[PDB]
Design a protein around this ligand. Structure first.
Ligand SMILES: [Zn+2]
Ligand SMILES: [Zn+2]
Ligand SMILES: [Zn+2]
Lengths: 241, 148, 49, 202, 320
């Protein structure tokens, strides 16, 4: 039975090598060969197959994803960390590598120093979901001054009215009312000061109505004097209250 | 030149199998029939785009008008009104009369049986994949790892 | 950057930081930074090559 | 279709002290692409010399890339630092290096290591020397200190074995009895000695 | 942000026809007496520069001629084609005298060293080859590109060889060792055109994503000329600082080299009987006087543009 299994493995490897040699650029043959080698419990053989496939074409996302998933499905954690470090240093613009690296080093790794590794992604100015996930990760690690610096760099790097509203809500939920008032004042001074966005003023009026109704009425009057229908609705709400 | 209904069914099945532009492949099936005969029989009678309906008032008015304009040119007249030349000629005559795998696996099993019989009783410059890694590419090392 | 270069020596330049991607400020036309390496060095490189 | 093993053409052969002989003045012969390598089968620069007075005219057998890879002599196939077989040194230090046996994989691996060495400084027996920092475990106990010149002795005259050497004392080959052919020490495959697999001396 | 200098706009003033294939390449004789076109007609035509009259037509190529260059220091004409052959024509007898041979696929372009008299060709087999001119010996085979190398540029200063290829990469090579030195991967699409500035020691690369200005010799990124989002096939630069980007959809853009400001968009018409899909700039070149722009349009025409002297600065003001 061992000789028959060896002949079957030799025939399967010969057909896989012939399919590789017939069409080199077809990566599905590489993926099927690597998964068949991993299914027969040959980790270093599948690692050599994946390294050959990455030498053939390193720009494919799925080769890195499958080779890192094969490293993570076994106990080779440091091999997976090396694979993710190479995938980050070659292809920084693929956010899926960053997301799966952070889920590997946060759930399975459980290392806070990976957040410093995450700061490498903060060199690259990613999309806003990275900033939101880092805000929620710093909240899950119970840090609020670090998250204040994160949201300040988010406002400086990606300035938006929704971003300033999220900064105001995060400063209100972290029990820093003076910092929330200073952030609302800076957003009124900078974000849409002459553009007349009429949405950060509504959030400042809501924060003032949470704080003091006279300042909320003054903010509603200033928003009505600077200006739409939402400003008139906020002025009617301030006059009714 | 006769056409039985059996030959019409065989021709319909051959058109639905082999497409349109093959005709000699179709005429291989039909005994005592040519490819030109099969093409003419398809395009004259058995095509499903042939309007096998009755003539409307507009169709008859256009047929009488175009027969007045271009006399006895039915291959030109017929694609204008959408019918074929024979149907429109017959209808024009009628209107004037009215107006008047396993084998390789078995071979591999037989070769394995012969190999076990010879073992119970060169390499052709190849690469043996079961003996070692065929093209060993070591993974790149960095910042981690204590082996296993 | 030691992840970026594996067996390649430090003479070969590798662009990997984010600061390689940002554009430089537009600068003066008459400036020795944006200048050719001049005729005697071009002639020396030409004769050596 | 444009990959092949490059021909290794270099001077200054890497030899042991024992096979080099004892005279400080050696007369030396070099062929540019004379023979092939006994392991990686590439053509290489073949060096031939007489180590002494009544020696054998020893010549280089393996190429310089294989000898720089395993840190061995080009003729004796023994280690430069200790004069031991490479099976003994691999049992002493590390036996997880290995090498392919099929010819296409062997040529591909040798071309890759040759390109790695040529992209390196030029004279370094890869990271295996980095695994060779720990030493003097037990290999220094049985290592030779004197140059064993008896392996530069000339071959046994086959005509004298059949008792028909008509040259007599003019014959440079040895007129003495050979070793026992029934002894398993007399097999000595060269590829087994290079790869460190079932060598009886080791 | 400095204000860009005002460049006068350009206008079409003659259209030359007579080729029976796509005109793929245009080269200008260094004495500015005539110019030369290679086509998909498997013919190479020498045209008078001033009168526009057809001076000569040469046959001998078996496929589409992709690149034609004239030697500045020898009376030689170098032509590369899709027939995997490079021909050195002696103009002294108007005959092919040398055959550079060894490329496995179609040659997409070529360039001459201005000082050493060595030839470099880029082909579809993902290789560039460096040939000695007199001995017809391929002294180097630059490899490392994973796709077809669309264009090659050559210069006397370091680095000598610039290659742009279809795998979104630009390789700055070293001439004496035959090895790559700098790899630039900033482009998202195929780099189809590179052009070198005559005096500022900088160069620019063209792709359908963007146009990118860099800095010799390290290849540091300088500027991102944006806009003109089409398949840019060609790139030439004036000595006065005017950069012309020609695309495969027929649109032409004109830029200031320094500020990267687009000041003119020219979309010429086609031949009288011609489809709208047959509008595309394959090559373009200035003359030696830097006053005529000659484009090889895909409707089998050569279109020649002149400066418009009647325009002034307030008539065509610079935006921002
Ligand atoms: Zn020795
Ligand atoms: Zn060797
Ligand atoms: Zn004898």
């Amino acid at each position: 039975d061992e000789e028959e299994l060896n002949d079957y493995k030799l025939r399967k490897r010969k057909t896989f090598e012939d399919n590789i040699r017939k069409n080199r650029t077809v990566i599905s043959n590489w993926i099927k060969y690597a998964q068949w080698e991993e299914s027969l419990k040959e980790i270093q053989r599948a690692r050599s197959i994946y390294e050959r496939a990455l030498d053939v074409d390193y720009r494919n996302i799925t080769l890195w994803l499958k080779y890192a998933e094969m490293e993570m499905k076994n106990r080779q954690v440091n091999h997976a960390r090396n694979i993710w470090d190479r995938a980050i240093t070659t292809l920084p613009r693929v956010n899926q590598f960053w997301y799966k690296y952070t889920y590997m080093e946060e759930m399975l790794g459980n290392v806070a120093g990976a957040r410093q590794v995450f700061e490498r992604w903060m060199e690259w100015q990613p999309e806003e979901q990275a900033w939101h996930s880092y805000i929620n990760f710093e909240l899950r690690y119970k840090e609020v001054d670090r998250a204040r610096t994160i949201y300040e760099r988010f406002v400086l790097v990606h300035p938006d009215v929704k971003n300033w509203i999220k900064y105001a809500r995060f400063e209100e939920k972290h029990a820093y009312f003076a910092h929330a008032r200073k952030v609302y004042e800076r957003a009124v001074e900078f974000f849409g000061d002459e553009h007349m966005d009429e949405h950060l003023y509504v959030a400042f009026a809501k924060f003032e109505e949470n704080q003091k109704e006279f300042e909320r009425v003054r903010v509603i009057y200033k928003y009505a004097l600077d200006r739409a229908q939402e400003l008139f609705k906020n002025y009617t709400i301030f006059e009714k209250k | 030149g006769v056409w039985r209904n059996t030959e019409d069914e065989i021709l319909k099945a051959a058109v639905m199998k082999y497409g349109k532009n093959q005709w000699s492949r179709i005429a291989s099936l039909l005994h005592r029939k040519s490819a030109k005969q099969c093409k003419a029989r398809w395009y004259e009678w058995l095509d499903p785009s042939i309007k096998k309906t009755e003539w409307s008032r507009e169709e008859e008015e256009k047929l009488l008008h175009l027969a007045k304009l271009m006399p006895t040119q039915w291959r030109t007249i017929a694609p204008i009104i959408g019918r074929t030349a024979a149907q429109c000629l017959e209808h024009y005559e009628f209107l004037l009369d009215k107006a008047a795998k396993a084998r390789e696996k078995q071979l591999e099993e037989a070769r394995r049986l012969a190999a076990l019989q010879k073992r119970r009783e060169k390499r052709k410059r190849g690469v043996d994949y079961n003996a070692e890694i065929p093209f060993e590419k070591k993974p790149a090392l960095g910042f981690y790892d204590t082996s296993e | 950057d030691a992840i970026a270069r594996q067996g390649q020596s430090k003479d070969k330049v590798i662009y990997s930081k984010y600061t390689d991607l940002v554009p430089k400020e537009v600068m003066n036309a008459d400036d020795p930074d944006l200048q050719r390496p001049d005729e005697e060095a071009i002639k020396e490189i030409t004769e050596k090559t | 279709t444009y990959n092949r093993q490059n021909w290794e053409d270099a001077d200054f052969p890497i030899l042991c002290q024992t096979c080099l002989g004892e005279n400080p003045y050696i007369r030396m012969t070099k062929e540019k692409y004379g023979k092939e390598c006994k392991i990686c089968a590439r053509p290489f620069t073949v060096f031939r010399w007489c180590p002494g007075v009544r020696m054998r005219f020893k010549k280089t057998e393996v190429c310089q890339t294989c000898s720089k890879l395993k840190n061995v002599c080009q003729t004796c196939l023994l280690d430069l630092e200790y004069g031991l077989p490479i099976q003994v040194r691999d049992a002493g230090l590390s036996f997880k290096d290995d090498m392919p046996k099929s010819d296409v994989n062997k040529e591909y691996y040798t071309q890759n290591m040759e390109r790695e060495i040529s992209n390196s400084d030029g004279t370094r027996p890869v990271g295996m020397l980095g695994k060779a920092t720990s030493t003097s475990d037990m290999l220094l106990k049985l290592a030779r200190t004197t140059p064993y010149y008896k392996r530069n002795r000339p071959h046994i005259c086959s005509f004298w074995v059949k008792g028909e050497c008509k040259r007599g004392e003019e014959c440079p080959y040895r007129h003495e009895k050979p070793t026992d052919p029934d002894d398993p020490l007399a097999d000595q495959n060269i590829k087994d000695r290079y790869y460190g697999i079932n060598d009886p001396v080791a | 942000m400095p204000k860009p200098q005002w460049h006068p706009p350009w206008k079409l003033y003659r259209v030359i026809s007579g080729h029976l294939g796509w005109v793929r390449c245009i080269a200008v004789e260094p004495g500015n007496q005539w110019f030369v076109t290679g086509s998909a007609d498997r013919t190479i035509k020498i045209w008078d520069l001033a009168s526009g009259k057809l001076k000569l037509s040469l046959t001998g190529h078996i496929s589409t001629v992709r690149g034609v260059i004239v030697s500045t220091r020898s009376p030689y004409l170098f032509s590369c084609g899709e027939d995997k052959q490079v021909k050195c024509w002696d103009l002294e007898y108007n005959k092919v005298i040398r055959h550079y041979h060894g490329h496995l696929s179609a040659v997409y372009g070529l360039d001459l060293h201005p000082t050493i008299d060595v030839l470099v060709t880029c082909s579809r087999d993902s290789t560039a080859r460096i040939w000695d001119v007199r001995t017809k010996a391929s002294v180097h085979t630059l490899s490392g590109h994973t796709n077809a190398v669309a264009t090659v540029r050559c210069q006397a200063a370091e680095p000598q060889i610039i290659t742009g290829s279809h795998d979104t990469t630009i390789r700055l090579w070293d001439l004496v060792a035959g090895k790559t030195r700098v790899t630039l991967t900033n482009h998202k699409k195929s780099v189809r055109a590179v052009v070198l500035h005559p005096r500022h020691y900088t160069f620019a690369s063209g792709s359908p994503d963007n146009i990118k200005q860099w800095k010799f010799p390290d290849g540091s990124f300088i500027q991102n000329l944006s806009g003109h989002n089409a398949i840019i096939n060609t790139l030439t630069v004036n000595s006065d600082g005017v950069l012309v980007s020609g695309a495969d959809n027929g649109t032409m853009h004109l830029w200031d080299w320094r500020t990267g400001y687009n000041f003119q968009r020219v979309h010429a018409a086609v031949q009288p009987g011609s489809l709208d899909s047959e509008s595309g700039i394959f090559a373009c070149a200035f003359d030696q006087s830097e006053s005529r722009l000659l484009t090889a349009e895909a409707d089998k025409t050569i279109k020649v543009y002149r400066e418009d002297d009647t325009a002034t600065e307030e008539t065509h003001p610079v935006s921002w």
